[PDB]
Amino acid sequence: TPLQKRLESVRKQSSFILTPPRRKIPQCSQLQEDVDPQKVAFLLHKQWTLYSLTPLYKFSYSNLKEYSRLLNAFIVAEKQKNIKVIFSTLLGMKGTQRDPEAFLVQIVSREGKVLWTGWFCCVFGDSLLETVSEDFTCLPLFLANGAESNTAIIGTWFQKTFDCYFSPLAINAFNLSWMAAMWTACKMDHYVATTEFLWSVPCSPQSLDISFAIHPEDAKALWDSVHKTPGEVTQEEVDLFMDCLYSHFHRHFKIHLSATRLVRVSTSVASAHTDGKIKILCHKYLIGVLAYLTELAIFQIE
Amino acid sequence: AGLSHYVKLFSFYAKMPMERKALEMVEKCLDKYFQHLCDDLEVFAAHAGRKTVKPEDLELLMRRQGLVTDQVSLHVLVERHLPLEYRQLLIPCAYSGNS
Amino acid sequence: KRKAPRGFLKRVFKRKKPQLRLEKSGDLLVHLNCLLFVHRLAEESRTNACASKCRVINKEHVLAAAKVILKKSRG
Amino acid sequence: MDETVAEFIKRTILKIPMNELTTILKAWDFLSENQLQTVNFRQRKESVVQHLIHLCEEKRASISDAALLDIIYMQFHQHQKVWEVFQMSKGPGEDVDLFDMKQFKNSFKKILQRALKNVTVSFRETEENAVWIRIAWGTQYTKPNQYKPTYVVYYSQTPYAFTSSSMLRRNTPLLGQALTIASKHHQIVKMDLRSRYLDSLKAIVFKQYNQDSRIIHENIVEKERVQRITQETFGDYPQPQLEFAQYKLETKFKEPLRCLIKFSSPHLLEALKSLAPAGIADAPLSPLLTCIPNKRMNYFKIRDK
DNA sequence: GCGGCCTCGGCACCGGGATTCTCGA
DNA sequence: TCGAGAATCCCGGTGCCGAGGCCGC
């Protein structure tokens, strides 16, 4: 139960038993309780570089001032090798009531020039909560956006004080295509941005990239062509949406896009890269986009 | 020598890399600093009517340089920059034998 | 740097002006004067560097620093 | 030795890298041979950018030649500031019997300062016979802005006149207008060729670029064919477009289905050439993608037909 | 020609210009 | 119906961290 449950989970995950996760179309997530409108709205249109964060040992959402000081005195000491660190519980970035409340880590520089704005969130991540003990407050997702240098310093501090480890979360093109499909399946209005899929062909000498940017309403009507079962999108439906893209690109330019790999799928819901600098959160679906992102972080942790 | 001591101390006082061509000109700045000082101590000690230059002969001069004030006296200025074994000579400690 | 030359300041005070009677630790006061003068030099030269936004102190900033501080440090 | 001139020279002298300091400072002629030895070019960046600008303080540098410094900087760094291609078109008649570089310099500056009264237009007749106009813009309400100039590489008697696509303001229809009225043309048309490599745009718009026994490969009859068809569409030494070769598709999926394809490679026409042999592409590789130089176009706006 | 030093530069995130399209002369 | 104001699509013009160069042991 305290570990052996996780061993059985690892067994289930490694078994790879008929995975196709028929996923519910990201439902309009009415902003739960507090969710500081200024804070969350500041947190939306920021390009979060995802990481996978192992559960934090001996963490508490009461000693935020002590960790703030302990990390502020560490960051400016890494400059010895002007900065304020504000740990801020977000109070609403959680899928179920039992999830740990998401909390921020902002490198505030004089004025509120937030240099780094870290973000640990655990939403709909009850595949990790029910397997880890009480001492660990598990937040699988870590969100950077500040320079990679400051991330590779706060990550070291977190490893030193909490025994949590940051693997840079890399969304594979399979998961990328999945999220590119469930985000054009959403029920949104006033599409903010075009549905762009930045492909990148695997040529050895050259590195040609393709931006198969579709009109966002035109991709919704193309998704409805391959959408038959409502409520949940299947792997076959996602693959048929992606293959309709393939058969509209190889039709035009005679180059098989399916022979290439997704690197970035911009959508009116949320942009999503591969190499880590992934989640822009244009719309307020972020509890669903973050649900997928946390479910993907479990895959890397577990 | 001592000018090289001050240009090296300039490095740990400016907290920022400079040029050597800047340092021989700050050397002329120190040379003229003495060319104003040692005859400013001259004229200030002559103003007190004393041949020698007592510590209060220089406290007035540093009052002229605006570094001694009613808030910042002479001795407090010794705290902030001079090392302990050197300010032991300048500011009077107490052993019932104040220096 | 954590030093203050006893010999050098006395040799300078004797070379430049041959007729004084600087007290037992008066040269230490002269060192304090030069320490604070070079403090003013460093800080106002940092100001001069930010004036032209030069990330290295150069000749054209030191010469401007001199005519302000050296004149200011005159008694 | 002036406002927005001395510091402008400073900002264009830290732009140029250390290796080609002599190369650009020799060509702009303010530093004669005697002046080169005074400054030690090999020491430091802030040292040279301070001593050289002093060497113009004594030389009383003016914006007319400060802009020429920027021109010469870009002549070796033309692979930045992505370039639009303008195509002039005379009607029926004889060619421009009078493109006097003096007259063209007059007929361009006069027309440009007719409306944009405060501009610092600085020409540099290059040795490849192509006047390298640089335009610092600014309306009558403001001073000419040298922060973001619009270099225009007008080939001297050519209908094609490259243009640094800086901001595409209200001056762009005046940039084309002054260009087509200085050189004795009538219609200025943006070719919609937009590439970062001017040395490749020059090639495209002028058509100047092409002038084991055990391993039994079962699909050898197909590899030979795909290699053949990639040699009659991409003949030899393709030029690097390196540009977002857009294809703003408006076609129905087989009412329309809008798309905004953007092929993006450090070297595009070579990346496409190694596509079909790499298995990514079919052998006849969609003339939309092969005829980028053949049509002298990469910013496509295709429809259905 | 290497050791800790430093300097350009691709990638990328944040700041105004002209096109949409709503409202006043 | 039309003219100025605001917002926001399209791409800069900027910020900023790895790569290459370079000078003692």
Do A and C make contact via 3 or more CB pairs under 8 A? The reply is no
**Where does chain A have alpha helices with state H?**
4-15, 37-44, 64-80, 126-129, 148-162, 173-183, 216-226, 235-253, 286-301
Tell me which residue has tokens 């200030």: B44
Q: Which of B5, B10, B54 lies at the smallest CB-CB distance from C3?
A: B5
Q: Which residues in chain B have Cβ-Cβ distances shorter than 8 Å to C72?
A: 65-66
Decide if D264 and A213 are in contact by the 8 Å CB cutoff.
no
Decide if D275 and A203 are in contact by the 8 Å CB cutoff.
yes
What is the Cα–Cα distance from B34 to B32, expressed in whole angstroms? Answer: 5
Q: How many CA atoms lie within 13 A of B91 on its CB side?
A: 17
Q: Look up the protein residue whose alpha carbon has the minimum distance to the C1' of E13.
A: A47
DSSP β-ladder status, D261-263 and A209-211: unpaired
The one-letter amino acid code at D166 reads S
What is the Cα–Cα distance from A59 to A137, expressed in whole angstroms? Answer: 6
Q: Which of C21, C32, C49 lies at the smallest CB-CB distance from B81?
A: C32
How many angstroms separate the CA of residue D249 from the nearest CA in chain C? 49
What is the Cα–Cα distance from A291 to A26, expressed in whole angstroms? Answer: 9
Q: Look up the protein residue whose alpha carbon has the minimum distance to the C1' of F9.
A: A193
What is the Cα–Cα distance from A67 to A61, expressed in whole angstroms? Answer: 10
Q: Environment class of residue A294 by beta-carbon count within 10 Å: exposed (0-12), middle (13-18) or buried (19+)?
A: buried
How many angstroms separate the CA of residue B46 from the nearest CA in chain C? 10
Tokens standing for residue A191: 């599409």
Q: Which residues contact A62 (CB under 8 A, 6 or more apart)?
A: none
Phi and psi at residue A197, to the nearest 5°: -120, 105
Find, among A178, A153, A163, the residue nearest to A77 by Cα. Answer: A153
F16 C1' to D195 CA distance, Å: 26
Chain C contact partners (≥3 CB pairs within 8 A): B, D
How many angstroms separate the CA of residue C8 from the nearest CA in chain D? 32
Contact D265, A206 (CB under 8 A): yes
Query: Which of residues 37 through 66 in chain B touch C, CB cutoff 8 A?
Result: 37-45, 51-55, 57-58, 61-62, 64-66
Query: Which of residues 65 through 94 in chain B touch C, CB cutoff 8 A?
Result: 65-67, 77-78, 81-83, 86, 89-90
Q: Which residues in chain C have Cβ-Cβ distances shorter than 8 Å to D46?
A: 54-56, 58
The one-letter amino acid code at A55 reads P
Q: Residue D47: closest CA among chain C residues belongs to which residue?
A: C58
What is the Cα–Cα distance from A160 to A153, expressed in whole angstroms? Answer: 11
What is the Cα–Cα distance from D245 to D82, expressed in whole angstroms? Answer: 12
Q: Look up the protein residue whose alpha carbon has the minimum distance to the C1' of E16.
A: D167
CA distances from residue D215 to A246, B72, D218, D226, D227 in whole angstroms, order as listed = 32, 90, 9, 19, 19
The one-letter amino acid code at D175 reads L
How many angstroms separate the CA of residue B6 from the nearest CA in chain C? 8
Q: How many helices (H) and strands (E) does chain A have?
A: 9, 12
Contact D159, D184 (CB under 8 A): no
What is the Cα–Cα distance from A154 to C59, expressed in whole angstroms? Answer: 40
Contact D138, D121 (CB under 8 A): no
SS (H, E, C) chain C: CCCCCHHHHHHHHHHHCCCCEECCCHHHHHHHHHHHHHHHHHHHHHHHHHHHCCCCCCHHHHHHHHHHHHHHCCC
Query: Which of residues 168 through 197 in chain A touch D, CB cutoff 8 A?
Result: 194, 196
Contact A209, A2 (CB under 8 A): no
With CA of A146 and C1' of each nucleotide, the nearest comes out as E13
E5 C1' to C58 CA distance, Å: 20
Radius of gyration for the alpha carbons in chain D, expressed in angstroms and rounded:
23
Q: Which of C30, C62, C74 lies at the smallest CB-CB distance from B36?
A: C74
Tell me which residue has tokens 């020059």: D202
Chain F nucleotides near the protein (CB, 7 A): 9-14, 16-18
Tell me which DSSP letter residue D1 carries: -
- Cβ contacts of A144-149, under 8 Å, gap ≥ 24: A144/A48, A144/A49, A144/A50, A144/A51, A144/A116, A144/A118, A145/A46, A145/A47, A145/A48, A145/A49, A145/A116, A145/A117, A145/A118, A145/A119, A146/A107, A146/A115, A146/A116, A146/A117, A146/A118, A147/A115, A147/A116, A148/A49
Method for structure elucidation: cryo-EM
Q: How long a stretch of residues is chain A?
A: 302
Query: If DSSP codes are grouped into helix, strand and coil, which group holds residue D115?
Result: helix
Find, among A290, A250, A27, A24, the residue nearest to A169 by Cα. Answer: A290
What is the Cα–Cα distance from A70 to A85, expressed in whole angstroms? Answer: 9
Tell me which DSSP letter residue A137 carries: B
Q: Residue A255: closest CA among chain D residues belongs to which residue?
A: D281
What is the Cα–Cα distance from D30 to D32, expressed in whole angstroms? Answer: 6
Q: Look up the protein residue whose alpha carbon has the minimum distance to the C1' of F16.
A: A147
Strand ranges in A109-215 using DSSP code E only, listed in sequence order: 118-121, 141-143, 166-167, 196-200, 209-211
Q: Chain C to chain D, count of Cβ pairs less than 8 Å apart? A: 10
Tokens standing for residue D235: 């003949």
E4 C1' to D29 CA distance, Å: 39
Contact D285, D275 (CB under 8 A): yes
What is the Cα–Cα distance from A94 to A132, expressed in whole angstroms? Answer: 17
The count of other CB atoms within 10 Å of the CB of residue B35 is 15
How many angstroms separate the CA of residue C49 from the nearest CA in chain D? 12
Contact D148, D166 (CB under 8 A): yes
Q: Which residues in chain A have Cβ-Cβ distances shorter than 8 Å to D281?
A: 253-256
Give the dihedral of Cα atoms B65, B69, B74, B80; nearest 10 deg.
-90
**What topology is assigned to C6-73 in CATH?**
Histone, subunit A (1.10.20)
E1 C1' to D39 CA distance, Å: 28
Tell me which DSSP letter residue D125 carries: B
Q: Environment class of residue B12 by beta-carbon count within 10 Å: exposed (0-12), middle (13-18) or buried (19+)?
A: exposed
CA distances from residue D18 to D26, D40, D68 in whole angstroms, order as listed = 14, 12, 19
Decide if D50 and C55 are in contact by the 8 Å CB cutoff.
no
With CA of A215 and C1' of each nucleotide, the nearest comes out as F9
Provide the CA B50 distance to its chain's centre, in angstroms: 20
E2 C1' to D225 CA distance, Å: 52
- Which residues, by CB, come closer than 7 Å to strand F? A 147-150, 192-194; D 82, 147-148, 165-167, 260
Contact D193, D204 (CB under 8 A): yes
Q: Environment class of residue B53 by beta-carbon count within 10 Å: exposed (0-12), middle (13-18) or buried (19+)?
A: buried
Decide if C55 and D46 are in contact by the 8 Å CB cutoff.
yes
Suggest the residue from D10, D45, D46 to mutate for an interface test with chain C (most C CBs closer than 10 A): D46
Tokens standing for residue D86: 């303008």
Q: Environment class of residue A79 by beta-carbon count within 10 Å: exposed (0-12), middle (13-18) or buried (19+)?
A: exposed
Tell me which DSSP letter residue A55 carries: P
What is the Cα–Cα distance from D81 to A101, expressed in whole angstroms? Answer: 47
Tell me which DSSP letter residue D212 carries: -
Interface contact D208, partner A, CB < 8 A: no
Chain E nucleotides near the protein (CB, 7 A): 6-14, 17-18
Q: Residue A244: closest CA among chain D residues belongs to which residue?
A: D253
> ∠ CA(B9), CA(C56), CA(A81), 5° rounding?
70
Q: Which of D257, D258, D281 lies at the smallest CB-CB distance from A255?
A: D281
Positive or negative, the Cα torsion across D83, D89, D94, D100? negative
Phi and psi at residue D162, to the nearest 5°: -60, 160
How many angstroms separate the CA of residue D50 from the nearest CA in chain C? 9
Decide if D46 and C60 are in contact by the 8 Å CB cutoff.
no
How many angstroms separate the CA of residue C55 from the nearest CA in chain D? 8
